[PDB]
Amino acid sequence: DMLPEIAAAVGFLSSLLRTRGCVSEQRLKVFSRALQDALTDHYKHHWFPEKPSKGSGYRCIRINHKMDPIISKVASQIGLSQPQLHRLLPSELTLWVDPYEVSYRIGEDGSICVLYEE
């Protein structure tokens, strides 16, 4: 039910690490599965398909001077350190993973990009 939205968000992050970092497609497959698991666990009791923006603040993935703690923990379990994540991911990024819609913004004043929409 939350599968495809979380898959799209994870893939977006995984693609950033591939493109900017040349992180192995092999290592990134493990990372993707790891992060999928972690986000579906985090999101379980906070997903309202009828009100897609309900809980969106909670589900929101934010990166700036502080790394999102879930991304940080999962990347670390997989071989990507936090100094790496700061270097390889965009310096300010926000990712909204909601029922029927995944969107993101790079930079505070970046435009809103829709990634997944059903």
From Swiss-Prot:
Keyword Translocase (UniProt): no
Family: Belongs to the BTG family.
Subunit details: Interacts with PRKCABP. Interacts with CNOT7 and CNOT8; indicative for an association with the CCR4-NOT complex. Interacts with PIN1, inducing mitochondrial depolarization.
Domain of life assignment: Eukaryota
GO BP terms, alphabetized: anterior/posterior pattern specification; associative learning; cellular response to phorbol 13-acetate 12-myristate; central nervous system neuron development; dentate gyrus development; DNA damage response; negative regulation of apoptotic process; negative regulation of cell population proliferation
Entry's induction text: By nerve growth factor and tumors promoters.
Function field: Anti-proliferative protein; the function is mediated by association with deadenylase subunits of the CCR4-NOT complex. Activates mRNA deadenylation in a CNOT6 and CNOT7-dependent manner. In vitro can inhibit deadenylase activity of CNOT7 and CNOT8. Involved in cell cycle regulation. Could be involved in the growth arrest and differentiation of the neuronal precursors. Modulates transcription regulation mediated by ESR1. Involved in mitochondrial depolarization and neurite outgrowth.
Keywords: Phosphoprotein, Transcription, Transcription regulation
GO molecular function: transcription corepressor activity
Top-level taxonomy: Eukaryota, Metazoa, Chordata, Craniata, Vertebrata
Protein name per its UniProtKB record: Protein BTG2
